[PDB]
């Protein structure tokens, strides 16, 4: 009733229909982003439902600029529209000010398309007919705040974070991030940290076909890694834990 | 206004001037008339200033956008015909253009496409447009070769603008020199016309009919 | 559950209309894609309903969208028919814009795009058609294979199978196939396709149809005789 | 029964809309914010929430304009529309009449915006209540916005989670902060006291307090962090 | 029919220093052979170290400034108090000019301000769209008069050391902020003597990084 | 020239006793350049014949347009349109675009299979019924034709005498028309059958 | 563009296109085509005003190509010509008129017969064995009757076409600086090098 | 199933179509008999009060002078649809064809207005089945029934409404392949008196013909070349005449 | 695009230390024919602003209906809007300023030259100009049409600049404006012996003086001459 509406409130004051959309975000693959004072490292898990699936020609970390990247989980279908809109916003900013877009501000634009649910509601002319089953981890660097990590929620609005996990393994990943994080981290540490937490919240084996890192380092730009780079860091990790 | 670009075995040279008039008086001498679309492409402002400025920065935005989409690199053919289709829509509204899109991809080589505001698209290797276009053409054609030194191509891109300043009334300012290599464009500085005039004047024993 | 309507989400987070859309794909004929190194072969089951059915004028299950990208389908045949035409107007339009022929990577997005659009909205049902899009780039000669699904999610696979008992062909494929060395000869790669398709027809050599795309806008449809020789090699060895 | 929800376009037998009351509920479940004022300032102090301790809170004061501002309580997507709508009007006033928008005329425009969703099939009445302050030409004002769309001027009010404790603080100390004028610190301090009392099973943190102020010679200013640490 | 355009005089000038930049303008306003106004500042604060003067057609000028101030506030709201740089403003003004191009604006705009190397910057605009970085450019009726005089005292163009006769020539020198002002006061006064749309009073706003200050100087009413 | 008839062409329609004829020249011109010798002015739909004079692009466009309009009728009623009815159909197509209008002068010719009665009509630019059954001429030689036809016209000639009368009128006129001079095709139309006979005549 | 010809012989169709592209007082390029294939055996040359020419050629190209894919079978030249005529005659009543004039040659593979169709800008389809627009048709139409026969080999049609280029060159101020000569036959479309 | 215009039934068909058919059966009885030089169309009038003027009800309404109609079904639906029918007839087929349209063609337009009122859900189709009789110079005298199912059928003699089933066998029995109009006019009254008795009289039964051209109704003269209205409405006094000789 | 049919003459204005005096003729000419007399051209708006309108009478009406509707709009809501949220000449000006641009950008202008004069409720004079071109400017002496070149030099003697305003008082101001009407009656073809004059003061409020007649006639130089040809 409250949940089969779309703009119908429940007696607790929750728009149930919209509540239900959060469990869409979770069905997808885990991605864990960790902000550092050197840059943001974004990792993913990519599912292989077959050896025959080309897991390495599909990605869920995407390029939005030359210093803005996005992680996503949920419907890659809705990720296509959410990522496409966000790319337009970055570029049109670049058109208007010839200046870097702030991390947060790209996030405001992604949350504007999200607002739209309706078929009668006012604010902006509603043309989009349901919630979006897809979230973002938004990474960038402006120089007047530093490296930052924000989380887009299609059912809410922009949250600042030092680290977030989204996906299936989110809940348990988050504890580990409460446990191990530091402000005393370098990006080198930070990379082996995404991987150390990721594997425990993974049910697939930790290998390069089911993994993929990228970074926002202002100096190097948005850089998607190699499969050869990701395989190295798996070894360095294995060396560390034996020692430990 | 004098623009040109010419192709060689080493890449593309683009060379432009900096003088633009309104009346019979000069508004600016510091005009930049190569607009940097993206690192891989360069195009030139010529014709009417306002339209060229607005629609080339638009075209680099489109180029940046397509590269984000496809996870690729913009083509010279792709960029150029996005501009021609736009200008066609807007035509019949005072629109003026003179731009040549210069780009060197690995998949097609250096290529140059002239675009007009009539939606005219011409592949070629040699282009010079402007109102000083005739004077600089003189210079360009007779020294042009395919087999040609980089050093001496940079010498030709100064010489087209230099002659053209003296004979045309609206061309001068300074020379701007650019070389599009496979890895992007590289700048070869700004050279004031006056200082350049005495050096060349001496060098070939040309311009001995020009004294004052 | 929450199949009463498309726009309403679901406690379970799965839009039911998409899930049932998949189920519909299993109705239609099996299609299999297998990439080589110098080939992609795109084969499909061409199931014969009656013996009164023409081979004179009756549509093939495989449709060329443009002159170097090939497409098969599995699903609701009615629905596929407008999906293939919409794919095509854009495809040709790709040249209007750029003066470049259609790139396979731009094309999968587009086909996924019409589909995604239909799902997002509420006053249309999704397409009940998953497609395989095979082809090479114009610029380059590396073989490319894509899939679209009802949902509006697209993937690349090395080899992939859809419709009519898809599972059983998928497993078959894993065992036979090697990702270290995909077959680098057009003939042996064809043969792998024939073996797959054999299974779902049970018996037929007049109901297996093979099509091949090769680089530089070579697309050919194979003779019924030519396929029977390959079946002859496969029955003898077995 | 309760089959007279499910539509925002059907009156119940009792003559309520259940849908607007259920909007009043959504407010209580979000954060608390307190309004109060004097005659030289209007001040808003708001409890900010975080979701986890890697999260860095959520901003619940939006600057509307340099002589206006608002807080939110309830749903955050509903809030964004109204703070954007409100800004259109303030910019319009500057562009067309060269005039600061009056709080009272603002509020009745906001009222209208709401009644647009109430009549219509489709849409929802907004799930957020706003406490609006400004200082115009007729001095400081403070309005209380509701989902029904009623704007009501008050010397002090609170909406949100467990707001009776703050309204109790406010009642007792109504006259004390009205009479203070000219000292910006005292109104700031008084609002601090109210929101402490609102809380149950929590303590104040330097990043819970958000302070928002407008006056006679005070531009709109949003304090957070180490700016609310003089007045912690 | 109707001429939606006109000319209402004035003359304005922009100088880029290297720690400061000025934008000057006379406070005469004309409509044809009437003197409308004896004092009306053509040079307007926009905040954020941006002075903007859009001179030509007075209808287009005052609406172009007005629209700009609305844009400045909307940048504050969607970027949560971000600085608007002078080149960011410079591009913003591109789309305000190009946004009617089929019924365009009709003002020569100069903004002066401070760049992010912390040196003077001036960008002056072509009236229908387009901008370039300038160092001396003057807009308005007596732009002809004022501009080449400053390309000799500021720029040092076609000047050469004593007795050397072109062999080597004289370099630019660092400037005081006062010295730049005297050059602007002379130029305007000469333009009052030789021209009919200059005089009355001269406003020069100097953009430093201590704020946007105003300095006003009486000028000849004849 | 004139903007509505740069490319010329002439059509002439007469009535005989229970017969019509219609004939036209086959020269297409474009200014002063004679372009093609074979290019008919007259077209037909079922048993009604139509010549369309004028700016050459619109003759071709209405040929197609009328075929679309006639054939929609034929299939739906299961029977041929008649040349009485067909008159008012031309009149509406031409008037729909009064502003920016077709530049043609069409002339119908035809004989009913429900009266056995010749029907001819003329229309202008935005269309009119000119319901004379004297004789009807249009084209660039409009002036020339009205007189030549009038001189010869005796009402109620036998069909084969009528072939003499219209061919002669057309041939004299054509030599002295600047924008037509090449070829001729004459339709002698009867109830039973329709005989088409090309002339042999001078080229210019 | 500055010269456009068409002559149709025993088993081929021959079309000539200007190299020069005259833009104001400068010839910006002296070696560019002004013809594009519609199909592997249907060739459309174009001439007229600059800018109209280029976008029009490509737009028509997209449409004939799209039909060819749809039916998986190529449209007959007869069809193609009526399509190109229809676009011009619509444009003359539209917002933006073209000044693109075309000759479309095709070796009809269903009637096994060469066909040349001249189409002018305003929109007139005429079947004719000759064809040309501008002030190139005003020289070469006269010339063509005498030296033409009822048929000749494609080699003799080539030499006949060279004779019209020679007539134009002498008597017309316009430069074109040689011609691209493309033949349309039963076995594709080819380029022959010709002065 | 039955119960949207949108929903198809397990054995198919829309139910709204069937229910609209039901409406017709609750109607009054109208019937048509084709003769070799006419069509007679007849129906009755009722109104409840006798204080009602009966000459104000429209039920015999000429669409064109060439083509009359009656209905059975909803009274309101008739006036609206007669209004619409006329309007379409001049737009598609009197501005184009140049004269009032064919009996076959006009029946197809009427069906096409219905059909649009079936396609658009939440919009019911018309409550009426009409009988539309006319003359043209090609297909002769003709008679049709056009159902609220948006399909039309040609007929030799037919009846519709409540009393249809009783009338049709009378029509089978009494129709002969060659009849005159005057034997048809008497057969028409005779059959219609089965539908009701106790109230049947020449002022309450409305009966008209589409017979021979009448220049009497043309209203302009000295033009021999056109025909006059085929349609003729017979007055109350005529209907009494025929009822006495029967 | 609207073309003048019925038009007025001019407005003349000056400032003194505590107020403004705006006054304008009353004429409605259609070309040479002085068609209408008694066309009242000062319209009070609110209670501290008088708006004088010249140019079209056609367009005057439309503007009249607009500014009356301005007070109606101000008066909706607010229990105080007559000493707290009243209209002030700053507000009133900016309304008309915005329409004039708007109609110019439709390429269809409202043809008027308007002067908005009043005292603010902060005690600060406001006298600013707007017209159909959209041109806007403020100056201590404003005048419109003929009166801009013609009757403005007199007033510019009395108040030349900002610094001469506290030294001009109300009486001096009042003599200047009447003195200016004498030039306009004499020596402008379109003029009227009647003219309406409103004195706006911050300390006394609004004073309206209706049909003041041109005086201090001189004509005794017309009997001097006998003319020549």
From Swiss-Prot, chain B:
Domain of life: Eukaryota
Keywords from the UniProt entry: Cytoplasm, Hydrolase, Nucleus, Protease, Proteasome, Threonine protease, Zymogen
Name of this chain's protein: Proteasome subunit beta type-5
Chief localisation class: cytoplasm
Described function: The proteasome degrades poly-ubiquitinated proteins in the cytoplasm and in the nucleus. It is essential for the regulated turnover of proteins and for the removal of misfolded proteins. The proteasome is a multicatalytic proteinase complex that is characterized by its ability to cleave peptides with Arg, Phe, Tyr, Leu, and Glu adjacent to the leaving group at neutral or slightly basic pH. It has an ATP-dependent proteolytic activity. This unit is responsible of the chymotrypsin-like activity of the proteasome and is one of the principal target of the proteasome inhibitor bortezomib. This subunit is necessary for chymotryptic activity and degradation of ubiquitinated proteins.
Known catalytic reactions: Cleavage of peptide bonds with very broad specificity
GO annotation, biological process: proteasomal ubiquitin-independent protein catabolic process; proteasome core complex assembly; proteasome-mediated ubiquitin-dependent protein catabolic process
Cellular component GO terms held in the UniProt record: cytosol; nucleus; peroxisome; proteasome complex; proteasome core complex, beta-subunit complex
Protein location: Cytoplasm; Nucleus
Top EC group: hydrolase
Entry similarity comment: Belongs to the peptidase T1B family.
GO function term, MF aspect, one: threonine-type endopeptidase activity
Active site: 1
Sites where the protein binds bortezomib: 49
Residue pairs linked by disulfide bridges in the UniProt entry: none
Protein EC: 3.4.25.1
From Swiss-Prot, chain F:
Cell compartment(s), UniProt: Cytoplasm; Nucleus
Nucleus found in the keyword field: yes
SUPFAM superfamilies associated with the record: N-terminal nucleophile aminohydrolases (Ntn hydrolases)
Alphabetical keyword list: Cytoplasm, Isopeptide bond, Nucleus, Phosphoprotein, Proteasome, Ubl conjugation
Gene3D superfamilies hit by this protein: Glutamine Phosphoribosylpyrophosphate, subunit 1, domain 1
GO BP term, example: proteasome-mediated ubiquitin-dependent protein catabolic process
Example of a GO cellular component annotation carried by this entry: nucleus
Pfam families xref list: Proteasome
Positions of post-translational Phosphoserine modification: 30
Keyword 4Fe-4S: no
Any one GO molecular-function label of the UniProt entry: endopeptidase activator activity
Cross-link entry Glycyl lysine isopeptide (Lys-Gly) (interchain with G-Cter in ubiquitin), positions: 69
Record text on subunit structure and interactions: The 26S proteasome consists of a 20S proteasome core and two 19S regulatory subunits. The 20S proteasome core is composed of 28 subunits that are arranged in four stacked rings, resulting in a barrel-shaped structure. The two end rings are each formed by seven alpha subunits, and the two central rings are each formed by seven beta subunits. The catalytic chamber with the active sites is on the inside of the barrel.
Family: Belongs to the peptidase T1B family.
Protein name: Proteasome subunit beta type-3
Lineage: Eukaryota, Fungi, Dikarya, Ascomycota, Saccharomycotina
Gene name, Swiss-Prot/TrEMBL: PUP3
UniProtKB/Swiss-Prot annotation, chain H:
Crosslink position(s): Glycyl lysine isopeptide (Lys-Gly) (interchain with G-Cter in ubiquitin): 104
Gene3D superfamilies: Glutamine Phosphoribosylpyrophosphate, subunit 1, domain 1
Domain of life: Eukaryota
Keywords: Cytoplasm, Isopeptide bond, Nucleus, Proteasome, Ubl conjugation
Gene Ontology CC annotation, any one: proteasome complex
Subcellular location: Cytoplasm; Nucleus
GO biological process: proteasomal ubiquitin-independent protein catabolic process; proteasome-mediated ubiquitin-dependent protein catabolic process
Miscellaneous note of the record: Present with 7060 molecules/cell in log phase SD medium.
Function: The proteasome degrades poly-ubiquitinated proteins in the cytoplasm and in the nucleus. It is essential for the regulated turnover of proteins and for the removal of misfolded proteins. The proteasome is a multicatalytic proteinase complex that is characterized by its ability to cleave peptides with Arg, Phe, Tyr, Leu, and Glu adjacent to the leaving group at neutral or slightly basic pH. It has an ATP-dependent proteolytic activity.
Family from the record: Belongs to the peptidase T1A family.
Subunit structure: The 26S proteasome consists of a 20S proteasome core and two 19S regulatory subunits. The 20S proteasome core is composed of 28 subunits that are arranged in four stacked rings, resulting in a barrel-shaped structure. The two end rings are each formed by seven alpha subunits, and the two central rings are each formed by seven beta subunits. The catalytic chamber with the active sites is on the inside of the barrel.
Curated annotation (Swiss-Prot), chain I:
Disulphide linkage map: none
N-terminal signal peptide: none
GO cellular component terms, semicolon-separated: cytosol; nucleus; proteasome complex; proteasome core complex, beta-subunit complex; proteasome storage granule
Chief location: cytoplasm
Gene3D superfamilies: Glutamine Phosphoribosylpyrophosphate, subunit 1, domain 1 (3.60.20.10)
Subcellular location: Cytoplasm; Nucleus
Any one GO biological process: proteasomal ubiquitin-independent protein catabolic process
Keywords: Cytoplasm, Nucleus, Proteasome
Note: Present with 16900 molecules/cell in log phase SD medium.
Similarity section: Belongs to the peptidase T1B family.
Function: Non-catalytic component of the proteasome which degrades poly-ubiquitinated proteins in the cytoplasm and in the nucleus. It is essential for the regulated turnover of proteins and for the removal of misfolded proteins. The proteasome is a multicatalytic proteinase complex that is characterized by its ability to cleave peptides with Arg, Phe, Tyr, Leu, and Glu adjacent to the leaving group at neutral or slightly basic pH. It has an ATP-dependent proteolytic activity. PRE3 and PRE4 are necessary for the peptidyl-glutamyl-peptide-hydrolyzing activity.
Protein name in the entry: Proteasome subunit beta type-7
Organism annotation: Saccharomyces cerevisiae (strain ATCC 204508 / S288c)
Designated gene of the protein: PRE4
């Amino acid at each position: 009733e409250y949940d089969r509406g779309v703009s119908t409130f429940s007696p607790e004051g929750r728009l149930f229909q919209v509540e239900y959309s959060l469990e869409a975000i979770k069905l997808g693959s885990t991605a864990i982003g960790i902000a550092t004072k050197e840059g943001v490292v974004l990792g993913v898990e990519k599912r292989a439902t077959s050896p025959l699936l080309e897991s390495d020609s599909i990605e869920k970390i995407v390029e939005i600029d030359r210093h803005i990247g996005c992680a996503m989980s949920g419907l890659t279908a809705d990720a296509r529209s959410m990522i496409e809109h966000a790319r337009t916003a970055a570029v049109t900013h670049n058109l208007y000010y010839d200046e870097d877009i702030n991390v947060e501000s790209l996030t405001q634009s992604v949350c504007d398309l999200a607002l739209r649910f309706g078929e009668g509601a006012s604010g902006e002319e509603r043309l989009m007919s349901r919630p979006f089953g897809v979230a973002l981890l938004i990474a960038g660097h402006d120089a007047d705040d530093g490296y930052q990590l924000f989380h887009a929620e299609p059912s809410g609005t922009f949250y600042r974070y030092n680290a977030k996990a989204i996906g299936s393994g989110s809940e348990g990943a988050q504890a580990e991030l409460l446990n191990e994080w530091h402000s005393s981290l370098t990006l080198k540490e930070a990379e082996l940290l995404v991987l150390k937490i990721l594997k425990q919240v993974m049910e697939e084996k930790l290998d390069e076909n089911n993994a993929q890192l990228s970074c926002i380092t202002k100096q190097d730009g948005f850089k998607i890694y190699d499969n050869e780079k990701t395989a190295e860091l798996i070894k360095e990790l294995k060396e560390k834990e034996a020692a430990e | 206004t004098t623009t040109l670009a010419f192709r060689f075995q080493g890449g593309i040279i683009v060379a432009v001037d900096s003088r633009a008039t309104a009346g019979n008086w000069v508004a600016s001498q510091t005009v930049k008339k190569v607009i940097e679309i993206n690192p891989f492409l360069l195009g030139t402002m010529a014709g009417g200033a306002a339209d060229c400025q607005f629609w080339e920065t638009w075209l680099g935005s489109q180029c940046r956008l397509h590269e984000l989409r496809e996870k690729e690199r913009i083509s010279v053919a792709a960029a150029s015909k996005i501009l021609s289709n736009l200008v066609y829509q807007y035509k019949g509204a005072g629109l003026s253009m003179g731009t040549m899109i210069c780009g060197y991809t690995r998949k097609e080589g250096p290529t140059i496409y002239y675009v007009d505001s009539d939606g005219t698209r011409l592949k070629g290797d040699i282009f010079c447009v402007g109102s000083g276009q005739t004077f600089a053409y003189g210079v360009l054609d007779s020294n042009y070769k395919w087999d040609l030194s980089v050093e001496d191509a940079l010498y030709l891109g100064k010489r087209s603008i230099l002659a053209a300043a003296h004979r045309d009334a609206y061309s001068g300012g300074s020379v701007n020199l650019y070389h599009v290599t496979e890895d992007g464009w590289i700048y070869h500085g700004n050279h004031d016309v006056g200082e350049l005039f005495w050096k060349v004047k001496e060098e070939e024993g040309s311009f001995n009919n020009v004294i004052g | 559950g929450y199949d009463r309507a498309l726009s309403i989400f679901s406690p379970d987070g799965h839009i039911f209309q998409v899930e049932y859309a998949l189920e519909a794909v299993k109705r239609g004929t099996c299609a299999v894609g297998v990439k080589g190194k110098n080939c992609v072969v795109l084969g499909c089951e061409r199931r014969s309903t009656l013996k009164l059915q023409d081979t004179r004028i009756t549509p093939s299950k495989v449709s060329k969208i443009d002159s170097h990208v090939v497409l098969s389908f599995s699903g609701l045949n009615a629905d596929s028919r407008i999906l293939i035409e919409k794919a095509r107007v854009e495809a040709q339009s790709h040249r209007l814009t750029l003066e470049d022929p259609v790139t396979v990577e731009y094309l999968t997005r587009y086909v996924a795009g019409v589909q995604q659009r239909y799902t997002q909205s509420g006053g249309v049902r999704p397409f009940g058609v998953s497609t395989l899009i095979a082809g090479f780039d114009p610029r380059d000669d590396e073989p490319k294979l894509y899939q679209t699904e009802p949902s509006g999610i697209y993937s690349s696979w090395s080899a992939q199978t859809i419709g009519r008992n898809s599972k059983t062909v998928r497993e078959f494929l894993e065992k036979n196939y090697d990702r270290k060395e995909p077959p680098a000869t057009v003939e042996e790669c064809v043969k792998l396709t024939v073996r797959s398709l054999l299974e779902v027809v049970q018996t037929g050599a007049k109901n297996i149809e093979i099509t091949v795309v090769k680089p530089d806008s070579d697309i050919v449809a194979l003779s019924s005789e030519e396929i029977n020789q390959y079946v002859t090699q496969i029955e003898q060895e077995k | 029964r309760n089959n007279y929800d499910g539509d925002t376009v059907t009156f119940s037998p009792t003559g309520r809309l259940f849908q607007v009351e259920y909007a009043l509920e959504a407010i209580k479940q979000g954060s608390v914010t307190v309004g109060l004022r004097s005659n030289t300032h209007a001040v808003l102090v708001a409890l900010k929430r975080n979701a986890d301790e890697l999260s860095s809170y959520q901003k619940k004061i939006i600057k509307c304009d340099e002589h206006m501002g608002l807080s939110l309580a309830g749903l955050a997507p509903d809030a964004r529309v109204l703070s954007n709508y409100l800004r259109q009007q303030c910019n319009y006033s500057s562009l067309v009449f060269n005039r600061k928008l009056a709080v009272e005329r603002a509020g009745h425009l906001l009222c209208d915006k709401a009644q647009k969703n109430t009549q219509s099939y489709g849409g929802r009445p907004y799930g957020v209540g706003l406490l609006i302050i400004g200082y115009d030409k007729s001095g400081a004002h403070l309005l209380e916005f509701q989902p029904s769309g009623n704007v009501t001027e008050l010397y002090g009010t609170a909406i949100g989670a467990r707001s009776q404790g703050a309204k109790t603080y406010l009642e007792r100390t109504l006259d004390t902060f009205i009479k203070i004028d000219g000292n910006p610190d005292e109104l700031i301090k008084a609002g601090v006291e109210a929101i402490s009392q609102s809380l149950r099973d929590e303590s104040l943190t330097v990043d819970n307090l958000s302070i928002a102020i407008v006056g006679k010679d005070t531009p709109f200013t949003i304090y957070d962090g180490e700016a609310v640490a003089k007045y912690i | 029919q109707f001429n939606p355009y006109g000319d209402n005089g004035g003359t304005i000038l922009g100088i880029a220093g290297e720690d400061f930049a000025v934008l000057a303008g006379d406070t005469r306003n004309i409509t044809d052979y009437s003197i409308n106004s004896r004092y009306e500042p053509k040079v307007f604060d926009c905040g954020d170290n941006i002075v903007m003067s859009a001179n030509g057609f007075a209808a287009d000028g005052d609406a172009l400034v007005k629209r700009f101030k609305n844009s400045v506030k909307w940048y504050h709201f969607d970027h949560n108090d971000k600085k608007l740089s002078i080149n960011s403003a410079a591009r913003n003004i591109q789309h305000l000019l190009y946004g009617k191009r089929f019924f365009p604006y009709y003002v020569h705009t100069i903004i002066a301000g401070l760049d992010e190397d912390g040196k003077g910057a001036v960008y002056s605009f072509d009236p229908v769209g387009s901008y370039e970085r300038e160092q001396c450019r003057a807009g308005g009726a007596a732009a002809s008069l004022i501009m080449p005089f400053l390309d000799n005292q500021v720029n040092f163009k076609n000047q050469y050391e004593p007795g050397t006769n072109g062999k080597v020539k004289k370099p630019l020198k660092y400037l005081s902020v006062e010295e730049v002002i005297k050059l602007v006061r002379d130029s305007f006064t000469s333009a009052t003597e030789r021209h009919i749309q200059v005089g009355d009073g001269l406003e020069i706003l100097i953009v430093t990084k201590d704020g946007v200050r105003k300095e006003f100087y009486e000028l000849k009413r004849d | 020239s004139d903007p509505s008839s740069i490319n010329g062409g002439i059509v002439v329609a007469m009535t005989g006793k229970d017969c019509v004829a219609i004939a036209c020249d086959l020269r297409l011109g474009s200014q002063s350049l004679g372009v093609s010798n074979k290019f008919e002015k007259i077209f037909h739909y079922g048993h009604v014949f139509l010549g369309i004079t004028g700016l050459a692009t619109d003759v071709t466009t209405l040929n197609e347009m009328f075929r679309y309009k006639t054939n929609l009728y034929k299939l739906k009623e299961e029977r041929a349109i008649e040349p009485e009815t067909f008159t008012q159909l031309v009149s509406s197509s031409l008037y729909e675009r009064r502003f920016g209008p077709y530049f043609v002068g069409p002339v119908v010719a035809g004989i009913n299979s429900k009266s056995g009665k010749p029907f001819i009509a003329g229309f202008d630019l935005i269309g009119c019924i000119d319901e004379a059954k004297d004789f009807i001429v249009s084209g660039t030689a409009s002036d020339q034709l009205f007189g030549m036809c009038e001189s010869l016209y005796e009402p109620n000639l036998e069909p084969e005498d009528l072939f003499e009368t219209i061919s002669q009128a057309l041939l004299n006129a054509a030599d002295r028309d600047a924008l037509s001079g090449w070829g001729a095709v004459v339709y002698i139309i009867k109830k039973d059958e329709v005989v088409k006979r090309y002339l042999k005549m001078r080229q210019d | 563009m500055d010269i456009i010809l068409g002559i149709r012989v025993q088993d081929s169709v021959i079309l000539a296109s200007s190299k020069a592209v005259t833009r104001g007082i400068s010839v910006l390029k002296d070696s560019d085509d002004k013809t594009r294939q519609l199909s592997p055996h249907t060739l459309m040359s174009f001439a007229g005003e600059a800018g109209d020419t280029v976008q029009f050629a490509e737009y028509i190209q997209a449409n004939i190509q799209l039909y060819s894919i749809r039916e998986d079978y190529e449209l007959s030249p007869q069809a193609v010509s009526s399509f190109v005529r229809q676009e011009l005659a619509k444009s003359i009543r539209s917002r933006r008129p073209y000044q693109v004039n075309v000759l479309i040659g095709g070796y009809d593979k269903k009637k096994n017969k060469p066909e040349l169709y001249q189409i002018d800008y305003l929109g007139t389809k005429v079947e004719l064995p000759y064809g040309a627009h501008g002030y190139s048709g005003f020289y070469t139409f006269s010339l063509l009757d005498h030296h033409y026969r009822p048929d000749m080999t494609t080699e003799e049609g080539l030499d006949l076409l060279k004779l019209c280029v020679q007539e134009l060159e002498k008597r017309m101020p316009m430069d074109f600086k040689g011609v691209i000569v493309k033949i349309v036959d039963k076995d594709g479309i080819r380029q022959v090098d010709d002065f | 199933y039955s119960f949207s215009l949108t929903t198809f039934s397990p054995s198919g068909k829309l139910g709204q179509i069937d229910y609209a058919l039901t409406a017709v059966k609750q109607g009054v009885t109208s019937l048509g008999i084709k003769a070799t030089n006419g069509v007679v169309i007849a129906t009755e009038k009722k109104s409840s009060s006798p204080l009602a003027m009966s000459e104000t009800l429209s039920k015999v309404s000429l669409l064109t002078p060439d083509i009359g109609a009656v209905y059975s079904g909803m009274g309101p639906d008739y006036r609206v649809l007669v209004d619409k029918s006329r309007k379409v007839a001049h737009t598609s087929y009197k501005r184009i064809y140049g004269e009032y349209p064919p009996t076959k063609l006009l029946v197809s337009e009427v069906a096409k207005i219905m059909q649009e009122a079936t396609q658009s859900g939440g919009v019911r189709p018309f409550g009426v089945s009409l009988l539309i009789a006319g003359h043209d110079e090609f297909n002769g005298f003709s008679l049709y029934q056009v159902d609220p199912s948006g399909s039309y059928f040609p007929w030799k003699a037919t009846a519709i409404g409540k009393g249809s089933v009783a009338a049709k066998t009378f029509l089978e029995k009494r129709w002969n392949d060659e009849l005159e109009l005057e034997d048809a006019i008497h057969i028409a009254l005779l059959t219609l008196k089965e539908s009701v008795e106790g109230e049947f009289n020449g002022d309450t039964i409305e009966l008209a013909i589409i017979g021979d051209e009448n220049p009497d109704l043309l209203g302009y003269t000295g033009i021999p070349t056109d025909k006059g209205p085929r349609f003729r409405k017979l007055t109350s006094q005529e209907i009494n005449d025929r009822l006495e000789a029967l | 695009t609207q073309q003048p049919i019925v038009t007025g003459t001019s407005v003349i204005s000056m400032k003194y230390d505590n107020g403004v005096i705006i006054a304008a003729d009353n004429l409605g000419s259609y070309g040479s024919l002085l068609r209408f007399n008694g066309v009242e051209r000062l319209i009070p708006v609110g209670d501290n602003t008088v708006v004088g309108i010249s140019g079209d009478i056609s367009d005057m009406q439309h503007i009249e209906r607009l500014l009356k509707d301005l007070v109606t709009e101000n008066a909706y809501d607010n229990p105080l809007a007559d000493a707290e949220e009243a209209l002030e000449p700053s507000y009133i000006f900016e309304y008309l300023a915005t329409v004039m641009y708007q109609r110019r950008s439709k390429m269809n202008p409202l043809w008027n030259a308007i002067i908005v004069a009043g005292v603010q409720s902060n005690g600060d004079q406001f006298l600013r100009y707007v017209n159909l071109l959209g041109v806007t400017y403020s100056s201590p002496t404003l005048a419109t049409g003929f009166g801009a070149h013609m009757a403005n030099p007199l007033l510019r003697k009395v108040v030349d600049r900002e610094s001469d305003i506290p030294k001009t008082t109300v009486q001096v101001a009042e003599e200047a404006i009447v003195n200016a009407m004498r030039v306009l009656y004499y020596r402008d073809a379109r003029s009227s012996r009647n003219f309406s004059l409103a004195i706006i003061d911050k300390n006394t409020g609004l004073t309206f003086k209706k049909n003041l007649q041109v005086e201090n006639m001189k004509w005794d130089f017309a009997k001097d001459i006998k003319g020549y040809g």
